[PDB]
Design a protein around this ligand. Structure first.
Ligand SMILES: COC(=O)c1c(CN2CCN(C(=O)CCCNC(=O)c3ccc(C(=O)[O-])c(-c4c5ccc(=[N+](C)C)cc-5oc5cc(N(C)C)ccc45)c3)CC2)nc(-c2ccccn2)nc1-c1ccc(F)cc1Cl
Ligand SMILES: COC(=O)c1c(CN2CCN(C(=O)CCCNC(=O)c3ccc(C(=O)[O-])c(-c4c5ccc(=[N+](C)C)cc-5oc5cc(N(C)C)ccc45)c3)CC2)nc(-c2ccccn2)nc1-c1ccc(F)cc1Cl
Ligand SMILES: COC(=O)c1c(CN2CCN(C(=O)CCCNC(=O)c3ccc(C(=O)[O-])c(-c4c5ccc(=[N+](C)C)cc-5oc5cc(N(C)C)ccc45)c3)CC2)nc(-c2ccccn2)nc1-c1ccc(F)cc1Cl
Lengths: 142, 142, 142, 142, 142, 142
């Protein structure tokens, strides 16, 4: 039934609510990072962590919708519909994969612990009111 | 990069091409089967096998396209060309998910070796000349 | 000298005569099956079994006749009598290759003993009087 | 897919490009050599090297096309077509088997090493320009 | 054949396309820089590390092109050192030598690990959102 | 700035100029012989030897000038320019590459000592008067 990817990873789906929209880099940058620094283990036919499994499984989904967005700009003679659909692709759909792809890439580099710790210390950051807040946003580190 | 769905789990996308599209059961069916069997592996925060860890994504990935069918269902003016898309969503873009679900369900329920041993077997049957050919079909045991 | 194709691999050309020509799947089919299964044994420069080492030759041997069909396809004036030849190429001269491919594919995929154990079995079925005779057909397991 | 016989033998198909057309003896001499000095292991139902496997598998192909050339001179009432076809049989088709049969026969007698070494030292021979070239062509030796 | 110059160096041509073109200093700076630190090593008769080997061949490969464009300045008017020759050499082909020279000059200075790390450790810093990142890029330490 | 391309290997430009001009085979032949002999080490992501490193960079250098030979074929319309310019890459500068390609290739297969001896021998052989020079040129040795 209703399942959260973060369940087995010590996280939650509501945990990403604290992260604003622009917190996540663009999807193009998302794939390119994994396509640059992780290409070995991804196409490697022998995974080592579950993140490698979900990641290469997740990249196919986004690569899947890309063909969808390509076809939509092929047979839909309603430019308003092709606008909203293609826009909605980069919208919450794309914003969903961003919330997912970013985690695993952040997961593989730092583990599944510091990414939690950062998201822990980030939400408390944005939790704090404006004036009494450390203006330098917390940096993802190790 | 060019990640492929089925490399570390034995079979590959070249292998599944034997099975015609008509063999794959409807996505409405599979979503209950391994789910009605598995209220735990699809919900426990402690993984057991990469299959359901890979299965969760298509689960999440399916509802997204379903959410797209939901979102598109009202927020588009012309349902005529729209349903042309929703047909494309269920038929084609769901066909790939129809295979991703069918693998891990049968695999997780019958061991990975059985599905590989069955994939080769059915392709043998499908390529045998139908002039005389056994009317048998998928066996699946433990 | 009078070399025979099937001496060291168990079965012999006298044995394969049980199988009528209609049983053998089309060469268009077999060329993908063991190839789609085997991107390595058909490409690795380090052999494993003599089958694919024997299989490569018919692969090369097939394209030659196919190259002959290609070369003949334009460099002959009358395609009427020409296609009489190209029919003879695919039908008869390809029939022998149709058997050479079918053996090693099934043999390399199911062990040499299974095909020998299956060859005798089918001949038993083919010679049983069809007045009452099992409607079964090639089994193939491990 | 596209496969080279020389892949598992430390050679390549492009390696034979250095060898001119007349480098290879006629096919009749090719079979007769194997039909004279190797008849024991060829019809022997227990091979000892992969060359014995590919060789007896290769001889059948050429023996196969011979029946083809025989039939072509039986029902094709176009003498130009029977000319070009039969000529093309002895052409690059036959020149292909010559490149193959010669290697294995040369392989079995000297191993799969000196035949490479010779073809290594032969191409460098023909690589050298005319005037500054050792006029005595390199001899296949042991 | 296809020989990426970074194969025996860890990095690949695709990892280096992960950085913007402006990331690489100008061509003349690298020549003067390398010629301002390794006159004692480049023109030395004996090489210590392979970077000296690749770098020496890298520079002379550049001097030929500059020598090339110079000679082209006396052939014709537009497509000779004016419209296409010096434009293509100085602009297009320069983009790949800028990284060849930069990598080795960067490498031997700080080893090969550090140059491999800095690419990734920088190439994502340019991808991180503006607000949630440090103000200045990282720096090659050791 | 003027770095010896050969100073690492004892020989200098005078020695390869010490031999005649057309003694060096055509550019494509070396790449043929280079690809045939050393298809594996040049693809290998491991530092085989100093010759391999320079040989890879040597080929990629030629790979670029051939690209400009291809670029001029398309984005250059003046036949007086496109033809004459190719005479610089294909004819004028190719000699400078054939010296490198012939040296590094030969040194690998034989050894840096023998190639230097072979330079002196064939360098003095050609200068000996024709009336009393030995019959054949000196031989490549081990
Ligand atoms: C996983 O890797 C990534 O790719 C990655 C990372 C991680 N990267 C790591 C590298 N990185 C660097 O910056 C380099 C390290 C050096 N930096 C430093 O040392 C550094 C950086 C900032 C500060 C900072 O301002 O306070 C300081 C700093 C201090 C640090 C520690 C400290 N004490 C003692 C404890 C005291 C400090 O006192 C200071 C005092 C200052 N005054 C003078 C006022 C000023 C500064 C400081 C140091 C940026 C983050 N994050 C994120 C991300 C994106 C959006 C939102 C949140 N997170 N996304 C990705 C990602 C992106 C795309 C993609 F596809 C995939 C991925 Cl996964
Ligand atoms: C595998 O077997 C085969 O069947 C076979 C062979 C091998 N055979 C072996 C037997 N064979 C002989 O000749 C007998 C051996 C005795 N010969 C010698 O001693 C001999 C032969 C030639 C020379 C030669 O001219 O330089 C020399 C010679 C020297 C030798 C070594 C030497 N030092 C110290 C290192 C110094 C030398 O200084 C000389 C100096 C000279 N001055 C006075 C100028 C003159 C000569 C020499 C010696 C010929 C080759 N080759 C080829 C082949 C065909 C085409 C193209 C290339 N290759 N095809 C086949 C095949 C065919 C069909 C078939 F269906 C299947 C097969 Cl496989
Ligand atoms: C050989 O490689 C290269 O040439 C190279 C490099 C290497 N880079 C170059 C730049 N570089 C530096 O800048 C030095 C570090 C700067 N350090 C700091 O700023 C720094 C960091 C921390 C502190 C700190 O303790 O608080 C301080 C510091 C102070 C800071 C501010 C200050 N107040 C208030 C005014 C007072 C300070 O008082 C101090 C006092 C101290 N005491 C008393 C002991 C000690 C420290 C400090 C400074 C060295 C490394 N990069 C790049 C490149 C390319 C693209 C993009 C980015 N980069 N390309 C190349 C390349 C180019 C072309 C070519 F052909 C080939 C190559 Cl390879």
């Amino acid at each position: 039934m209703d399942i959260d990817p973060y369940k087995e990873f010590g996280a939650t789906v509501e945990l990403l609510s604290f992260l604003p929209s622009d917190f996540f880099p663009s999807v193009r940058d998302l794939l390119d990072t994994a396509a640059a620094l992780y290409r070995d283990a991804l196409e490697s036919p022998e995974h080592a962590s579950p993140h490698h499994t979900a990641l290469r499984q997740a990249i196919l989904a986004w690569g899947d919708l890309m063909t969808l967005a390509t076809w939509v700009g092929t047979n839909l003679e309603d430019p308003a519909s092709r606008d909203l659909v293609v826009s909605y692709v980069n919208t919450n759909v794309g914003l969903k994969f961003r919330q997912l792809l970013w985690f695993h890439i952040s997961a593989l580099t730092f583990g599944r612990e510091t990414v939690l710790e950062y998201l822990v210390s980030f939400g408390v950051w944005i939790r704090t009111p404006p004036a009494y807040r450390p203006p330098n946003a917390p940096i993802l580190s190790t």
